[PDB]
Design a protein around this nucleic acid. Structure first.
Ligand SMILES: [Cl-]
Ligand SMILES: [Cl-]
Ligand SMILES: [Cl-]
Ligand SMILES: [Cl-]
Ligand SMILES: [Cl-]
Ligand SMILES: [K+]
Ligand SMILES: [Mg+2]
Ligand SMILES: [Mg+2]
Ligand SMILES: [Mg+2]
Ligand SMILES: [Mg+2]
Ligand SMILES: [Mg+2]
Ligand SMILES: [Mg+2]
Ligand SMILES: [Mg+2]
Ligand SMILES: [Mg+2]
Ligand SMILES: [Mg+2]
Ligand SMILES: [Mg+2]
Ligand SMILES: [Mg+2]
Ligand SMILES: [Mg+2]
Ligand SMILES: [Mg+2]
Ligand SMILES: [Mg+2]
Ligand SMILES: [Mg+2]
Ligand SMILES: [Mg+2]
Ligand SMILES: [Mg+2]
Ligand SMILES: [Mg+2]
Ligand SMILES: [Mg+2]
Ligand SMILES: [Mg+2]
Ligand SMILES: [Mg+2]
Ligand SMILES: [Mg+2]
Ligand SMILES: [Mg+2]
Ligand SMILES: [Mg+2]
Ligand SMILES: [Mg+2]
Ligand SMILES: [Mg+2]
Ligand SMILES: [Mg+2]
Ligand SMILES: [Mg+2]
Ligand SMILES: [Mg+2]
Ligand SMILES: [Mg+2]
Ligand SMILES: [Mg+2]
Ligand SMILES: [Mg+2]
Ligand SMILES: [Mg+2]
Ligand SMILES: [Mg+2]
Ligand SMILES: [Mg+2]
Ligand SMILES: [Mg+2]
Ligand SMILES: [Mg+2]
Ligand SMILES: [Mg+2]
Ligand SMILES: [Mg+2]
Ligand SMILES: [Mg+2]
Ligand SMILES: [Mg+2]
Ligand SMILES: [Mg+2]
Ligand SMILES: [Mg+2]
Ligand SMILES: [Mg+2]
Ligand SMILES: [Mg+2]
Ligand SMILES: [Mg+2]
Ligand SMILES: [Mg+2]
Ligand SMILES: [Mg+2]
Ligand SMILES: [Mg+2]
Ligand SMILES: [Mg+2]
Ligand SMILES: [Mg+2]
Ligand SMILES: [Mg+2]
Ligand SMILES: [Mg+2]
Ligand SMILES: [Mg+2]
Ligand SMILES: [Mg+2]
Ligand SMILES: [Mg+2]
Ligand SMILES: [Mg+2]
Ligand SMILES: [Mg+2]
Ligand SMILES: [Mg+2]
Ligand SMILES: [Mg+2]
Ligand SMILES: [Mg+2]
Ligand SMILES: [Mg+2]
Ligand SMILES: [Mg+2]
Ligand SMILES: [Mg+2]
Ligand SMILES: [Mg+2]
Ligand SMILES: [Mg+2]
Ligand SMILES: [Mg+2]
Ligand SMILES: [Mg+2]
Ligand SMILES: [Mg+2]
Ligand code: NA
Ligand code: NA
Ligand code: NA
Ligand code: NA
Ligand code: NA
Ligand code: NA
Ligand code: NA
Ligand code: NA
Ligand code: NA
Ligand code: NA
Ligand code: NA
Ligand code: NA
Ligand code: NA
Ligand code: NA
Ligand code: NA
Ligand code: NA
Ligand code: NA
Ligand code: NA
Ligand code: NA
Ligand code: NA
Ligand code: NA
Ligand code: NA
Ligand code: NA
Ligand code: NA
Ligand code: NA
Ligand code: NA
Ligand code: NA
Ligand code: NA
Ligand code: NA
Ligand code: NA
Ligand code: NA
Ligand code: NA
Ligand code: NA
Ligand code: NA
Lengths: 7, 237
RNA sequence: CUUCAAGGGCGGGGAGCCAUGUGGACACGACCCGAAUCCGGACGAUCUACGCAUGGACAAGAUGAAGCGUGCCGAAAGGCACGUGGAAGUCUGUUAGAGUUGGUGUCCUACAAUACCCUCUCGUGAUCUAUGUGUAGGGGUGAAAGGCCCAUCGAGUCCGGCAACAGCUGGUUCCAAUCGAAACAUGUCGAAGCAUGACCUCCGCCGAGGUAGUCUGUGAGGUAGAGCGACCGAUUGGU
RNA sequence: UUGAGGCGCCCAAAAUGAUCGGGACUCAAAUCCACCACCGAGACCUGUCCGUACCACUCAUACUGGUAAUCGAGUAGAUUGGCGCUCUAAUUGGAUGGAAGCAGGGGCGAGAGCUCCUGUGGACCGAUUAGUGACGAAAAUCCUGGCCAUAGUAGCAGCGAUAGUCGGGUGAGAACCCCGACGGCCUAAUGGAUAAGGGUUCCUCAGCACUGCUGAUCAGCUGAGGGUUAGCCGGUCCUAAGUCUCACCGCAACUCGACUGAGACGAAAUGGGAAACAGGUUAAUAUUCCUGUGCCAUCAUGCAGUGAAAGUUGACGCCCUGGGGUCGAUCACGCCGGGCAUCGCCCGGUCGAACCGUCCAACUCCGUGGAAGCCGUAAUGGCAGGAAGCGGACGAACGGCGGCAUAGGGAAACGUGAUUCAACCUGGGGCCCAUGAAAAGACGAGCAUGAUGUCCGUACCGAGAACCGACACAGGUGUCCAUGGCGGCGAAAGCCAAGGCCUGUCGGGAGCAACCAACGUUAGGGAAUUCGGCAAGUUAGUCCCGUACCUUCGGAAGAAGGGAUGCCUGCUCCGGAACGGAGCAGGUCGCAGUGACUCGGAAGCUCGGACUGUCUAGUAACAACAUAGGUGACCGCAAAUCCGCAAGGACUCGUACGGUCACUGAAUCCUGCCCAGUGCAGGUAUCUGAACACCUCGUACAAGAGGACGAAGGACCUGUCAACGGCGGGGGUCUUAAGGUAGCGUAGUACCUUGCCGCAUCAGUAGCGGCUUGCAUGAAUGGAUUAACCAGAGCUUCACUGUCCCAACGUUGGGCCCGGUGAACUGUACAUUCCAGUGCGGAGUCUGGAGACACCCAGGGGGAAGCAAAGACCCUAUGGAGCUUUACUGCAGGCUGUCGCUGAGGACUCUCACUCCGGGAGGAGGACACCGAUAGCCGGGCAGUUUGACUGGGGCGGUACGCGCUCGAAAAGAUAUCGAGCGCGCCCUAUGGUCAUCUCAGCCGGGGACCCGGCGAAGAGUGCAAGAGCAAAAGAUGACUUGACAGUGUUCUUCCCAACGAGGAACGCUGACGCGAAAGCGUGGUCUAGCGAACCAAUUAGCCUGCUUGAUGCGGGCAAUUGAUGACAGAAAAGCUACCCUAGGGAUAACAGAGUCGUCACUCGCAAGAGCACAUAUCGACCGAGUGGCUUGCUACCUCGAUGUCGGUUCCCUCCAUCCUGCCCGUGCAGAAGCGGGCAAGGGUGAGGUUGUUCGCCUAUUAAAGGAGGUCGUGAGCUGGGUUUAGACCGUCGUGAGACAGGUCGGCUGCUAUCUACUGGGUGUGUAGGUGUCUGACAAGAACGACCGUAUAGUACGAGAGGAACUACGGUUGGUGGCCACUGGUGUACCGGUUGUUCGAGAGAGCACGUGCCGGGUAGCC
């Protein structure tokens, strides 16, 4: 939810 | 949105209250049936936390010990007087009627007997100008001509501690300490720096008010911010 | 009934009412589950934010402000030198304590639902900290990041309203026989949906024709092709 | 010579392994013309049966017979007969001679299902008929339970706390329970005392089923007992912030609510406070019990005393500092006890309270004295208003001294002095825009004796096992011990006591492999690495010398740079002295003297923010927030601002030097112009402006209509920009007010852009400087600039270095084997795959081939679009929420008029209600204000919502959203696209209607007007698109007329077929008319566009109707006309979200795949042209034909219950359209150097500077430094610079939220490998007892590629300049395999030096992180 999974 | 800061204020919570429990004395003129025979001796000179100015302790003839809004030049030993016949010297309190015109006065009553209302901050002073069987004209420190009952009592001299505003605070820490002795929330965040939800000026991609800063007097609390009922703004013209 | 008038609308030569099974419709939870809400009353400041009350904490060293002193110079104002003094949101500092920059290291079914190691910042102040106390949910608190208010925050938590609503995804349990589609038209805040038609099926009625094929006859037609000294408009040249 | 045909050839390049399905085929197993015989479906024929339909018989849908060439497939769905389950009823049965259920098995039915046998079971169970219903499961990431694989697998290692070993004890059993020894670990804690919290965890005995990361005899576990003793320690009492209760008031009301009054509560470490010490004692308590001794309070008695309440105390901030002084620590010497054994050292002890008595320095004061310059301090200071000195009053310690004490304690001695001095005592100075509690209580206020002193707490833990965190959790959690020794500045490191511990609790084994975590050392080079020096390294302590620019004069600054540094001998100086400090001379060891440890790398340029400070608890610490400072606004306090529904409240114990509301953000130089719009405010003749009252009309009243007056507000006018904001185009004004001033400028703002020039580098999308026309800089939306400051962004230099060339060796913990313990993730099924193909276009399973004996160990992770998450992106839904606004609608609030309270005599007086000030007397105010009610205005402060659809995704654009014409449309009708051409939302009283008269365009001839004749089927005209119609007219002229009429229909259309409204049209009727002789024509315009529901209102004519009833008023209704919804079959309606949320969609976009190939790349055909002549050495237009699948674009097939991004990296395979290398052809080929082409993929194709870049630019090397495919190969491999979350800034846009195909700083990389795959290693089976040696089907290789030099030769060639070759040699580079004599690295084997500390010294050792550091280094590995 912040780009790369899950950053 | 959410109530703006000015709205949390009214609720009178801790953060917004003055540390009253740390205040010394509700400075108010003494009462005298009449005669004026009252007078006491200055016993000490203390620091008044509520006004960041000195106040004088006094013991009266009828053994009454109370703190007094001290004018300048009042030292220990001095003898003050409070009454219609009180002498016309600095420190004495008497009805404007008995005070000679042109004399600097402080701690003036609005209604006779209220114990003083006007001119009580560091170094300020009112000015008795006109006498009358009816009205005593006093020029308050704001420069306004106030029409008062010649029966309103007032102290002769200017308030002590004058010139306190001449030295800058220099550092946040000095404000901090002073602020902590008043009924005020500090520091201050500008609306423009908040979210739209928190203040009418909040939001945007950059910081700026979203409307003209001058608000109508008839505006509801929650929306009345910025320049309240400004008759004009700026320094020009 | 409308109506000078006329013409139209509705109705008329006795079949209903009740019961039982069953098909279907509407309201209700309405075949079942499925989600983000919204509203009410309550319970939370043992976490955390801010304030207040009462206590506690900061090895050691560095720099050396004002003030003061002695000496020299000066008419004086003062100046210079040395010393004294010990100021500071001051410096160094894994003192205690507080913080959390990099390693994008270790860990990542962890020791741990935020840890470990090294590195790094502050460390007499707008300081750090214990305990007590205040502020409560469209409300607090906020040096403001929509941060925080007990692993919960662009509106906490609990229970209730509540079986919320959805045209959206998923699922809906025994055997056989007959018939057997529509993926289209009209309307629609309608296009992931409906309604009305087309089309599928079932029932009652009617009672002798029907017409998917071919031929012929009486009619409708300007597409292919063709052609333009037949319109029209394009489109070569020569005497 | 030429025409035609058949087959073939050339043209003809692609990525793991070639293909026609394969093998393979050549007078065919190819192709073409004929021909022959066969194979081959469930089709067709045929036997029997079944169902369905129909016929005959029949009550029958029971039989029996018959017909089907014209019956037999089927999703959704309609219809119908039947099977099974529960319980009820009727009728009727079975069961202990064995019911139901269950397991295995037999028979029947198409089947649901029925039934029988056997075993089990041991008490119920059916059938038929009619009923009944919480009646049938393979599915829902379905629910609950159980279970398998996973797997004897991960974890029981990682933490600066690496901990044990040998004997022995107990025991059934011992690695971990106990004793000893040896060895270690903890030092503000791993020790001691405690708060909270826990709550019996404490002690004892007995145990091991549970718990304990293994075991256990042990235990915080199980069981049973036991254990906490107070006048003098806490609680209790007091009061703090503040809380509650009652009263009062409010509220519809309360368990609600502010004030006021009274009362109570509110502190156990850590606020205030009457009083206790020492020893002894238990398994467990202890200032509690016991012994000794002491003290306090109250009361009683007695004596004294009449004092007695004023005052003092309780009782207080921050910084600096002196004096007094105890413990401790250390020094000297004596005594007691121990240790050591070459010396003479080293360790421990040497005690003793509360209390009672007594002493008193500081401070203050008194007398004396009499200083005119002295006294005094660390410092400040002091004085004729009386200094020193002297004398004296008051007056301190938890201190000294005496007692206490032939008490206690010690085996003994049972000391004395000193220094520095925590505790404790007492002074001096400095700071505040900060002023640093209160109350109870004590004192003041004697003494003796006696009595009384209850109630509650008291165990234990207090943490890497007793607390919170689900756990015996590496996390979190307050106070006191801060004075143990060496060390040193130190509460620092390191080492060591006291005390604690070996429980940060699983072990055993392999020189112990790969691989991984922490880490040491690496030669030469030295940032070449990389986004970036990330990571690591360098430096370092103290003293001396010395120190730039700049600067706010403080600073910069430890700038920088240089030197010194140990031990030993003897000394000097400072001081009272230290076991304090500063130096001198001489001697002397090492590679090294802050020898370990502790311990800065340095310099410069630019950007930002002034500074310290604040922040996203859990990806952002920043430039963001704050700040002082600057400015503006509001307000005289019965205020401004703000909270409450009210009663009431904060600000405020406050008062303009105040405090509220905002903006800007230290200093420095400055801050231009604009008031047009918007906002705020002031004014206002006039205009506009509600309700009440008032006037008129209306109504026996009323509704209602109008008038007059007119508040705030608006119009209008003015003021105002440090108020929102603005500062251009054009010319030598225009919009809309002004038209960019100082400055700054390619900016964190500049698209073009890597701008141009310079610096710097071999090379510099970087950085800096200058220029600068600025896509789209600029003045408190602050501009410029700036010393200091900074875990902030960029860049340069010296130093340094395993970041890199290029890796090696080593150390510790794992890893691996063994004992014990023992999970989870995941699983439709099958599964030894590979190359291709196919398929919903991204297959282990389909198709064809190839390969393939089974099982097991280890590995790194290629594939299973691996595991994990119902995609956050995108669209969609008449979904959600937060936010905005001049969106829609409302609600608070403010302003204002009016009514009530409310009174006397469009302006005015008064006092009596009411308000306010005042203790009161009384003063101010006053019918106002407040309050209740209403009206107008302002009113995102707040609430609810809306903000449409179509669409080669969506948005923007458009409207193909209601209509008409031609074409599309395939000669009936119907027919789509954001298909092609293009129109309609009217106009017309004549441009309608009829009748009469008449014939038009155009051309020709005669006197572009008019007139005459002729030709003239239609090209004219007919209102408007288009298409169609029309000539004695539908056109023209003239005249007359109003049918553009009322009423009501039929039919078609709208909507083909085929339902659907309004609307339209065609054709009638009835009535009334116009014109004409009349037939007849006129239901508007020649035909097809010109249109609008319900409700509501107005309007037309007549009638019906309103609650017992008459009259009047005012309503309700039948018929119809008009008013608009163009989103046109009708809602009243704006946005943002990156803070986001949900339902879904591959129904729809981004990425990748797939199709296409316009684009892109490459080729070919023709060959104009030029190349001095010469197309074809070379270059080569136009046009034409193609191949590829790298670019772009298109499409929307695949995936939205996720197939992880770009670039880079590492590692493997491939393609040829070939850059180099080999072999060749041509040449505008003399040679040398080239230019072009051919075969050819074996090998090679490298290193760097800017940039995240791919791309590209640049430098130097080179034989050359080719291009491309592999999910734009490669995130269960890495990296994370860019795109693209949450924070922030700038520019632009926007009213605003906020946006951007703009820029910029910051910003968390998950998983234990089941299968398959490969690299290597084993165990089995097959060939069918053994040893040794071979063979070689096939398999792999690049095992070798390339360059320089010499001789050839200064030769051939050439005018010369210049300048080869074959061959033979030497060497280099890259790659490859192996090896260690040599060189080099390592080498925590080893030997030595040496710092700190401990064992007394010596000797000899331990620790300093897994070597303290330093120096050398064998084998082995490299
Ligand atoms: Cl202030
Ligand atoms: Cl059946
Ligand atoms: Cl206690
Ligand atoms: Cl002193
Ligand atoms: Cl090179
Ligand atoms: K997808
Ligand atoms: Mg997100
Ligand atoms: Mg007061
Ligand atoms: Mg405060
Ligand atoms: Mg601020
Ligand atoms: Mg913000
Ligand atoms: Mg708002
Ligand atoms: Mg700003
Ligand atoms: Mg709603
Ligand atoms: Mg708390
Ligand atoms: Mg000094
Ligand atoms: Mg500091
Ligand atoms: Mg520090
Ligand atoms: Mg935000
Ligand atoms: Mg069936
Ligand atoms: Mg059947
Ligand atoms: Mg044709
Ligand atoms: Mg069938
Ligand atoms: Mg029966
Ligand atoms: Mg199913
Ligand atoms: Mg496994
Ligand atoms: Mg060890
Ligand atoms: Mg035991
Ligand atoms: Mg125990
Ligand atoms: Mg109490
Ligand atoms: Mg206490
Ligand atoms: Mg005990
Ligand atoms: Mg105890
Ligand atoms: Mg443990
Ligand atoms: Mg090296
Ligand atoms: Mg580089
Ligand atoms: Mg590189
Ligand atoms: Mg670093
Ligand atoms: Mg001396
Ligand atoms: Mg820049
Ligand atoms: Mg800063
Ligand atoms: Mg964070
Ligand atoms: Mg930071
Ligand atoms: Mg951070
Ligand atoms: Mg300010
Ligand atoms: Mg700022
Ligand atoms: Mg430049
Ligand atoms: Mg300005
Ligand atoms: Mg601003
Ligand atoms: Mg989804
Ligand atoms: Mg989105
Ligand atoms: Mg919404
Ligand atoms: Mg009052
Ligand atoms: Mg709103
Ligand atoms: Mg749409
Ligand atoms: Mg047709
Ligand atoms: Mg007509
Ligand atoms: Mg309407
Ligand atoms: Mg009308
Ligand atoms: Mg419509
Ligand atoms: Mg329609
Ligand atoms: Mg979602
Ligand atoms: Mg699709
Ligand atoms: Mg994958
Ligand atoms: Mg080739
Ligand atoms: Mg090859
Ligand atoms: Mg890729
Ligand atoms: Mg590649
Ligand atoms: Mg991968
Ligand atoms: Mg990954
Ligand atoms: Mg992994
Ligand atoms: Mg990044
Ligand atoms: Mg970046
Ligand atoms: Mg970035
Ligand atoms: Mg060691
Ligand atoms: Na804003
Ligand atoms: Na809702
Ligand atoms: Na709290
Ligand atoms: Na000085
Ligand atoms: Na950290
Ligand atoms: Na809420
Ligand atoms: Na509920
Ligand atoms: Na719904
Ligand atoms: Na729908
Ligand atoms: Na369809
Ligand atoms: Na539709
Ligand atoms: Na027929
Ligand atoms: Na044709
Ligand atoms: Na069916
Ligand atoms: Na004493
Ligand atoms: Na020491
Ligand atoms: Na153990
Ligand atoms: Na600081
Ligand atoms: Na203006
Ligand atoms: Na204006
Ligand atoms: Na500007
Ligand atoms: Na800082
Ligand atoms: Na290394
Ligand atoms: Na794999
Ligand atoms: Na939201
Ligand atoms: Na709408
Ligand atoms: Na019609
Ligand atoms: Na092609
Ligand atoms: Na999927
Ligand atoms: Na990549
Ligand atoms: Na090759
Ligand atoms: Na991929
Ligand atoms: Na990548
Ligand atoms: Na990753």
């Amino acid at each position: 939810x912040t780009x790369p999974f899950x950053x | 949105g959410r109530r703006i800061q000015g709205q949390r204020r009214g609720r009178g919570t801790s953060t917004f209250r003055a540390p009253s429990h740390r205040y010394k004395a509700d400075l108010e003129h003494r009462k005298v049936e009449d005669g004026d025979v009252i007078a006491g001796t200055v016993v000490d000179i203390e620091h008044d936390p509520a006004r960041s100015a000195p106040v004088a302790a006094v013991e009266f003839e009828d053994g009454d010990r109370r703190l007094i809004l001290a004018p300048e030049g009042v030292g220990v030993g001095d003898e003050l007087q409070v009454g219609v016949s009180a002498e016309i010297a600095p420190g004495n309190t008497l009805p404007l009627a008995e005070i000679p015109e042109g004399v600097p006065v402080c701690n003036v009553e609005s209604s006779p007997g209220d114990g003083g209302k006007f001119a009580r901050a560091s170094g300020v002073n009112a000015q008795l100008l006109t006498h009358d069987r009816n009205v005593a004209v006093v020029k308050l420190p704001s420069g306004e001509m106030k029409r008062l009952d010649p029966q309103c009592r007032a102290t002769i001299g200017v308030v002590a501690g004058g010139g306190r505003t001449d030295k800058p605070f220099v550092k946040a820490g000095n404000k901090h300490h002073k602020m902590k002795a008043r009924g005020t929330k500090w520091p201050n965040v500008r609306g423009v720096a908040m979210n739209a939800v928190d203040h009418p000026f909040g939001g945007g991609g950059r910081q700026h008010p979203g409307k003209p800063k001058s608000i109508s007097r008839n505006a509801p609390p929650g929306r009345k911010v910025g320049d309240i009922a400004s008759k004009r703004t700026g320094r020009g013209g």
